[PDB]
Amino acid sequence: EEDRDNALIQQWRVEDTEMRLRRETLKQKKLQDLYKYEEENEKKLIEAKMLETEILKEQQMRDIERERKLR
């Protein structure tokens, strides 16, 4: 029975490693998503900035067009 106990020391390390690694695999899955979603917030913050920029920059054309139309 002591020899079983010695194995249990082993068996435990192994079972614990299994539980832990089940979680470690799950980490990596979760973590790629717990990143792409963060990336998404910057994607849109900059898009909003660049869009409003682009728009107000675009309307400077309309003022240029007013001058061109005048002549």
- Measure the CA–CA gap between 69 and 71, rounded to whole angstroms: 5
CA neighbours closer than 13 Å in the CB half-sphere of residue 36: 6
Q: Indicate the resolution in Å.
A: 3.8
- Measure the CA–CA gap between 64 and 60, rounded to whole angstroms: 6
Number of H helices, E strands in the chain: 2, 0
